């Protein structure tokens, strides 16, 4: 039903925390985009399980893209994941990808430490163009403030915004 595509870190990370507030209680598909060390910028995304991820995403009506804001954009893992949709749109193993994605609802959770409420707007507008291209309805988002793990818990505005993320 609901999938959370996490392009941040895991266990404690501000991205994980905010996402849990948004999907609390649901039996949501939790996707974590893998990355291997070569810490921000110290990794390289791993996409060995990309097809498995697409398979899971296709079964979900609601998609929540959760990401830290790196250099005023999304994470390296989420950027390489979305860029690969270009390949999937030409993939015979997922012949109805465009149509299937077009009926889904999308949400975004992004956390940054440099006045995200303002400096994170270009990223939200970028997501707007991405979803519009796919015909996906961009239903809502949350911009949260945080630098180190767990500091999002101090952004009460973001915590309550995430809890009220899913439209009703």
Binding interface with Pt ion (CB under 5 A): 1, 8, 13-15, 43, 61, 68, 73-74, 76, 79, 111
With CB under 8 A as the contact rule, the residue among 25, 41, 92, 95 that binds its own copies is 41
For position 52 contacting its own copies by CB under 8 A, the verdict is no
* Residue 52: its H or E element: helix 50-58
Distance of CA 68 to the CA centre of its chain: 9
Cα end-to-end span (Å), the chain = 15
DSSP-based helix, strand, coil % in the chain, nearest 5? 40, 25, 35
Question: What is the DSSP pairing of strand 29-32 with strand 35-37?
Answer: unpaired
User: Near its own copies by CB under 8 A, which window of 4-12, 13-21, 69-77, 94-102?
Assistant: 69-77
Query: For residues 91-110, which are near its own copies according to CB under 8 A?
Result: none
With CB under 8 A as the contact rule, the residue among 76, 97, 104, 146 that binds its own copies is 76
Residue 140 binding target from its own copies, Pt ion, none, CB below 5 to 8 Å by type: its own copies
């Amino acid at each position: 039903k609901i999938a959370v595509i996490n392009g941040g870190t895991r266990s404690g990370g501000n991205t994980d925390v905010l996402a849990e507030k948004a999907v609390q209680g649901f039996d949501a598909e939790h996707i974590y985009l893998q990355k291997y060390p070569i810490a921000q910028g110290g990794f390289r995304p791993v996409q060995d399980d990309y097809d498995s991820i697409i398979e899971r995403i296709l079964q979900c009506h609601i998609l929540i893209f959760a990401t830290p804001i790196y250099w005023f954009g999304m994470s390296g893992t989420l950027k390489l994941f979305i860029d690969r949709w270009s390949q999937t749109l030409r993939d015979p193993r997922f012949p109805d990808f465009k149509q299937q994605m077009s009926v889904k609802q999308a949400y975004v959770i992004a956390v940054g430490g440099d006045n995200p409420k303002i400096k994170g707007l270009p990223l939200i507008q970028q997501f707007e163009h991405i979803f519009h291209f796919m015909g996906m309805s961009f239903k809502g988002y949350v911009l949260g403030e945080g630098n180190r793990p767990g500091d999002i818990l101090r952004d009460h505005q973001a915590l309550s915004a995430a809890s009220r993320l899913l439209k009703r």
